[PDB]
């Protein structure tokens, strides 16, 4: 998070923030995640992941493109 | 402990006794009790100054030691006794050299436990120390407001003071009212909580049980006639008056604190 970038540079470049937190504090602990809803919304985000990964093996179809 | 009584008679229906089996079943230690005559509320001039007190069971004064000085002498707790003069139960402490004296019984204390008092000692329930030597954020009782005195604060059953801070010479105490009071660090405080915390769950059950505790009936102002009490008269359950004492001063939210000599010691008033 603590980013100095030497001296001649300036131009922000603080992906250190964007690839660490921000979303963790904000879109999660902004408004209440009703205990069960995480368990629901994760398990569908988890089931959607393996749906794509299992399809990615069977994606090699005829195509003809 | 808290046993509810079976309803074999009306006025034995709602009774709830605080039976302590560990208490003593015998006469108290005679050398440390003198007689204590009853005022009936009246004073020098023979006039009722405090109403609603009169009668009750004859009850002798136990010479309980609050100051708790006799230093550097371990002392075995011989037996826990009943005190009619007090909310809390007392303990007959036998000092190793061969004195006996009464103390307020803390929570975790029993017939056999050893207690020491003074400056060094150990940090354990029953052991009196100066509040300078006692840890911050610790539960004490029987607290002195002035060094060398007896013990004013936290002596009622279940009562305890918590030590919040220590600013040099002064110790900030959070009292059971909620008031944060500043006392001198040289003042003493017996460690732990005052025993018999079930006391509050007792329920008397009859009018008579208040009488034999030395209380007399309170008559309501509204019942009385105008001449007697500010609330008074009216042709059938009237009021239309702001609540007040029998002497006209407003009750029901009206600060009567006006010491002004001790306002320096009070950090935060209770709430």
């Amino acid at each position: 998070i603590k980013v100095r970038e030497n001296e001649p540079f300036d131009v922000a470049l603080r992906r250190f923030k964007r690839s660490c937190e921000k979303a963790g504090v904000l879109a999660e602990v902004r408004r209440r995640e009703f205990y069960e809803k995480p368990t629901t919304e994760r398990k569908r985000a988890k089931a959607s992941a393996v749906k794509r990964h299992a399809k990615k093996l069977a994606r090699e179809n005829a195509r003809r493109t | 402990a808290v046993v509810k009584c079976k309803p074999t008679s009306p006025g034995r229906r709602h009774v709830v006794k605080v039976v302590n089996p560990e208490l003593h079943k015998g006469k108290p230690f005679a050398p440390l009790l003198e007689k204590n005559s009853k005022s009936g509320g009246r004073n020098n001039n023979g006039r009722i100054t405090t109403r609603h007190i009169g009668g009750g069971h004859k009850q002798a004064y136990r010479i309980v030691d609050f100051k708790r000085n006799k230093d550097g002498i371990p002392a075995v707790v011989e037996r826990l006794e009943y005190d009619p003069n007090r909310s809390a139960n007392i303990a007959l402490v036998l000092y190793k050299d061969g004195e006996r004296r009464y103390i307020l019984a803390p929570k975790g204390l029993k017939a056999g436990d050893q207690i020491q008092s003074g400056v060094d000692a150990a940090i354990k329930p029953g052991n009196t120390l100066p509040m300078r030597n006692i840890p911050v954020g610790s539960t004490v009782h029987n607290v002195e407001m002035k060094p060398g005195k007896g013990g004013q604060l936290a002596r009622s059953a279940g009562t305890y003071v918590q030590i919040v801070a220590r600013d040099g010479a002064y110790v900030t105490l959070r009292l059971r009212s909620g008031e944060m009071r500043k006392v001198e660090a040289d003042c003493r405080a017996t460690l732990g909580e005052v025993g018999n915390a079930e006391h509050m769950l007792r329920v008397l059950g009859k009018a008579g049980a208040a009488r034999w505790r030395g209380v007399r009936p309170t008559v309501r102002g509204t019942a009385m006639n105008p001449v007697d009490h500010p609330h008074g008269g009216g042709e059938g359950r009237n009021f239309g008056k702001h609540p007040v004492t029998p002497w006209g001063v407003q009750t029901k939210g009206k600060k009567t604190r006006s010491n002004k000599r001790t306002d320096k010691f009070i950090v935060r008033r209770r709430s």
Partner: protein, 65 residues
């Protein structure tokens, strides 16, 4: 890469922080397994040791102290 070594086995300990600091990100958070490999058994031991090290002020809880 993976665990300790070929004949390592061992147990992930909290006292040493040279090898342990590789397993936390620049902010102070714990890095997950799917980035740094590691079998699930050692990732639990690691996590437990990071928290024990945090308690003693060997590792920091964060970088906003």
């Amino acid at each position: 890469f993976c665990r300790f070594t070929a004949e390592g086995v061992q147990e992930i300990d909290y006292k040493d922080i040279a090898t342990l600091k590789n397993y936390i990100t620049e902010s102070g958070k714990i890095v997950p397994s799917r980035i740094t490999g590691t079998r699930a058994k050692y990732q639990r031991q690691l996590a437990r040791a990071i928290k024990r090290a945090r308690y003693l002020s060997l590792l920091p809880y964060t970088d906003r102290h």
